[PDB]
């Protein structure tokens, strides 16, 4: 009676094969339902297309039904990581419903009727984050338990060492991005107001209008095209004549629009001059630059030999007079710009600077690089840690201190709502924004080829913001600081109602301060070397990227964090970690039968889902499966029990076994009820006595390839099994209840 349990793509998935079964049961000796909702991405595309499905084979549409949950008092939700897709992994997806007998209609890349518009716009609803902004209905409490600190100092994680000399740097624009251009206004009262736009010869396109709140912020901003491909020129120039890789860091993913003309700018540029010659043939053959060089290699298969030839030999001279560039996978050949989806910022700058600012390059050597981030608005405090490690070293996970984050989220905050209110510019003109009594708003001239795009946030979200935010300082005694760029206009706007909103608060024995954001991670950096913590008090975007940056440092992966959504109707949300779904944990596992999936944020989150449910329900017992858990958690922790990532261990698959025997042990060890404490005995020993064997079955796959059938919508069948395949555990879960 209360919690939905989130079903995912990619490693999470299969993590919940073998999690999910024993959650039910511990479960249900609460009287606690354990609902499954299915927001893979198979399955949204499936509940999407019921039109096109036998009545017998349709399927229920979770996302639409957990996006009202959401807003009722009485949600407890347990999300955990899913796909963002890009048109190639749509695509896959696609195919492999296609060859299981779901008629569900191609991607068009290119619409020219009526009906084929239709279909592109339901799919574009489907891409990108189609899930968190839907589900992100409060703000983002994101931070390290104490327990799993503790951890890390005992077993540190291993950190590249940084020399003084090293020559990696990010790179970024100067002119020519959003930053430079932004505008942003307050309104002071309700009201309609819309975004035009006026040509030269004075052409005139309503592009569309919005209701906006009264204390409503939105802004405004473009990017020039022009100097866009003009700076990926002297990027490459510079890696050319200095002699260190290239690598480009966007989230093609989430951003939907934009950063797919940015990634095919930047594989038009490096390849232009393959582009140069062959254009007319690739237009006619539909190639997209936007997709990678990969929509190169797929649609040349339908050429002659003879003249694919040629053009694989043509891109082959690119490579020989460009710069060397960072690879995916170079076994196989796989380049940074294949597709869009592969490397995206806030997983991957990490990466590099743990790896000594380094990244992996044709020969499979990792060295230094330029991490090449168009826009300059997030790419500078990159910079201000990657200097920060040359002059001082690595971190040290023993002695570090912690950086955690009070995010800005709730109700599509900033640039995550606005790829509605975004415009790929088809001339030279103007763009505003007006208030429809004609006064101005916001301004901006263009030219073609330029992105333009406007963003909102509303006074309810920010107001929660700030409140969580005191919330957090005063509940553990450590400073906190906005962080605020006090040349952007955007960041003005929301000084003002965060001074304004702070008095609305005790501050006694608080430390709370503004800055832009150079000096912000300068400070919290000078503190956490010294062992103390800072809270970063930040927007939507630096939510994502810093609860991925600081916790690599100092966990080894962001998998291990609390993350806590008090929705705003009265509910709450229990993210299972700050991370992504793991795509490269299922190679290993299709391969040989190994996952490496850390189910550690699961635990966490899960214990927080089961006090929640105590409170709120009253139910005195759920409340005790809670603590048994932290306890069951803390032996796991104690005890190393976690996958190591060595191929004659234990996986995910043994941790969970782990986790049920001291979860069993820790209640039938527990004297508070005598219900459970009867309930759990005859599980408890059982797995005690049984370790050995079960480890043993559970061991004995390595090495086998595992057939899943499918990838996108595996076959459940053979997944479960391939995940539950220690019958001698099977049959003490399944004999519980
Ligand atoms: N739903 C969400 O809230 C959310 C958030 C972020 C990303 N995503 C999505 O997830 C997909 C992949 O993201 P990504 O490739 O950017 O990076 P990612 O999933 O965050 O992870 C990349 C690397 O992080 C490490 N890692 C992440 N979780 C781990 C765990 N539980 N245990 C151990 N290591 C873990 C792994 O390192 P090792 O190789 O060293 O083992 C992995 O290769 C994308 O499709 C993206 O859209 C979703
Ligand atoms: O990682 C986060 O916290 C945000 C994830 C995200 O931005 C997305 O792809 O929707």
Known sequence: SKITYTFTDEAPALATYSLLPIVKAFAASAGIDVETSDISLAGRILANFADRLEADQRIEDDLARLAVLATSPDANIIKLPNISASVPQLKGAIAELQGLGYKVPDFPEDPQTDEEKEVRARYAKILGSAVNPVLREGNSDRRAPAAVKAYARK?????????????????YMRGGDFFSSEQSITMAKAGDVRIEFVGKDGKVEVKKQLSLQEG?????????????????????????????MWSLHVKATMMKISHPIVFGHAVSVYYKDVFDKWGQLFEELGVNPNNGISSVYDKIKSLPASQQEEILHDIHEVYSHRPEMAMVDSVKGITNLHIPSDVIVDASMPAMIRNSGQMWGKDGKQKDTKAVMPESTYARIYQEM??????????????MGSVPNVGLMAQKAEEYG????????????????????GSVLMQHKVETGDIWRACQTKDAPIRDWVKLAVTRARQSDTPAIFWLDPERAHDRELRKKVELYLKDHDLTGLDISIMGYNEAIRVSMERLIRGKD??????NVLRDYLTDLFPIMELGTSAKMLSIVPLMAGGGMYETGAGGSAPKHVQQLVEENYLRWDSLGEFLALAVSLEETGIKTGNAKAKLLGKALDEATGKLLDNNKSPSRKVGDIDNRGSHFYLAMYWAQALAAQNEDAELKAHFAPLAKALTEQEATIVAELNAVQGKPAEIGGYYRSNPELTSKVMRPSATFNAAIDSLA
């Open 155 to 171: 077993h540190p994680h291993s950190m590249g060492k940084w020399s003084m000399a090293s020559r990696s740097h990010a790179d």
């Open 216 to 244: 409503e912020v939105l802004d405004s901003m473009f990017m020039s095209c022009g100097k866009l491909r003009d700076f990926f020129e002297k990027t490459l120039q510079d890696c050319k004549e200095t002699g260190v």
């Open 386 to 399: 990657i200097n920060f490690c040359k002059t001082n070293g690595a971190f040290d996970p023993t002695t």
């Open 418 to 437: 606005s790829h509605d209110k975004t415009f790929e510019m088809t001339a030279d003109g103007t763009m505003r924004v007006v208030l429809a009594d």
């Open 534 to 539: 800072t809270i970063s008090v930040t927007g």
